[PDB]
């Protein structure tokens, strides 16, 4: 895009996804780290 038309596209979201696609093979096991429980997160008080 040139400089004139890219000004309209400012503050537009660009989303990237991902996945492994059958080539991925994980190695040696390691235990999990400490976890956070999600419902314990606070509500947005209004």
């Amino acid at each position: 895009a040139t400089s004139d038309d890219i000004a309209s596209i400012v503050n537009k979201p660009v989303t990237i996804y991902y996945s492994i696609g059958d080539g991925m093979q994980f190695s040696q096991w390691v235990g999990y780290q400490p976890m956070m429980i999600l419902d314990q997160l606070p509500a947005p008080v209004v």
Binding site: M35, M36, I37, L38, D39, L41
Partner: protein
């Protein structure tokens, strides 16, 4: 040859499927150089491990239970829930928790079923003699979390153990429920969506009678491993997050911000109108009848003072030299932006300067003043 036979009649769609992860040929644009190329694993690089039951067959240490000499012949040691979601709290404004591997790999699914082999490793010498029930009651609610003791426990399924020359036993927690599966205890960040199906209990049936050469207190470690019949089905939003980034951001509304897609801004000009992100929007300040509002934050100069409806459907924030020109008496007092009084109070265009932008969405301060 002319190909006059009438052609196909399809439907376009923009994207291949996402939840499909199985016997399904997926076409892409590989940045590999070869079309038949696949990443490979040479003779040492063939990896050892990936399977839900490969995770669910690993013990995770989940509870330290102190077991003293003078604990009586009915004292409770744990009432912990017979799900894989075992609560182990570490001592931030959010808290972090250990889990069994079967607990986390249950927390990446909706539903679970099957046995749960909890291993009690009772660390003692052969001189200590003990005895303790590991009971299991199916279906006790929160109000029935009380009224519990070993005498009402032994009605249900229970295993009495003697702590002697062998010191370790892996009890297999049954799966007893009305439902073929069982919903995740925690779910997404969502206050509805259920406690445990069943509860484990561990009471001291006969108290520790130690010899006078050894200690009065004994550690009991409680491991959790998914049973041999354990299996999970539906892949949903996980209920657990990592602690690589424990930062959390609240979203209370009393503090100020620019609207989404309008920060960062910069001081500049606009031919319809100084005032940009295309003029940056601002939230409508909740002003009742008979007040005024002006802003002071928490070009040629830093613009620490700045809200009125533009007329094009969204608010604008005009920069001022100071809070005096900003201090809203004219506009809330019935004026308009085209007033000569207003145009004198405005900053002229020459103060645009090099126009360095604001750092992100800087939180302004909403000063509310009487009119």
């Amino acid at each position: 040859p002319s190909y006059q036979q009438s052609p196909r009649h399809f439907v376009p769609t923009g994207m291949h499927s996402l939840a499909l992860g199985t016997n399904l040929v997926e076409p892409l644009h590989a940045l590999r150089l070869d079309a038949a190329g696949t990443t490979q694993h040479p003779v040492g690089c063939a990896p050892d491990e990936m399977t839900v039951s490969s995770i669910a067959s690993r013990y995770g240490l989940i509870r330290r239970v102190q077991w003293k000499k003078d604990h009586a012949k009915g004292s409770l040691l744990l009432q912990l829930d017979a799900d894989p979601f075992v609560e182990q709290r570490i001592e931030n404004p959010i808290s972090l928790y250990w889990f069994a591997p079967v607990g986390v790999v249950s927390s990446m699914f909706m539903q679970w079923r099957g046995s749960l082999e909890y291993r009690f490793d009772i660390i003692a010498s052969q001189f200590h003699t003990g005895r303790l029930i590991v009971g299991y009651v199916p279906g006790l609610t929160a109000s029935l979390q009380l009224q519990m003791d070993y005498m009402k426990l032994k009605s249900s399924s229970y295993v009495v153990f003697d702590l002697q020359e062998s010191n370790s036993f892996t009890f297999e927690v049954p799966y007893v429920s009305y439902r073929p599966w069982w919903v995740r205890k925690y779910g997404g960040n969502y206050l509805p969506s259920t406690d445990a199906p069943s509860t484990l209990f561990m009471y001291v049936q006969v108290p520790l009678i130690p010899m006078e050469a050894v200690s009065d207190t004994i550690d009991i470690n409680v491991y959790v491993r998914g049973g041999s019949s354990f299996e999970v089905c539906v892949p949903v939003q996980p209920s657990l997050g990592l602690n690589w980034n424990t930062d959390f951001i609240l979203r209370n509304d009393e503090e100020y911000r620019a609207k989404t897609g309008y920060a960062p801004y910069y001081a500049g000009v606009w031919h319809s109108f100084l005032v940009r992100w295309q003029i940056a929007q601002w939230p409508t300040i909740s002003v009742p009848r008979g007040e005024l509002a002006f802003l002071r934050i928490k070009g040629t100069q830093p613009w620490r003072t700045m809200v009125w409806p533009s007329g094009h459907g969204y608010n604008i924030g005009i920069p001022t030299y100071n809070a005096e020109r900003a201090r809203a008496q004219h506009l809330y007092g019935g004026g308009s932006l085209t007033d000569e009084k207003a145009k004198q109070l405005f900053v002229p265009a020459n103060q645009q300067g090099p126009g360095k932008v604001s750092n992100g969405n800087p939180v302004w301060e909403v000063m509310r003043a009487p009119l």
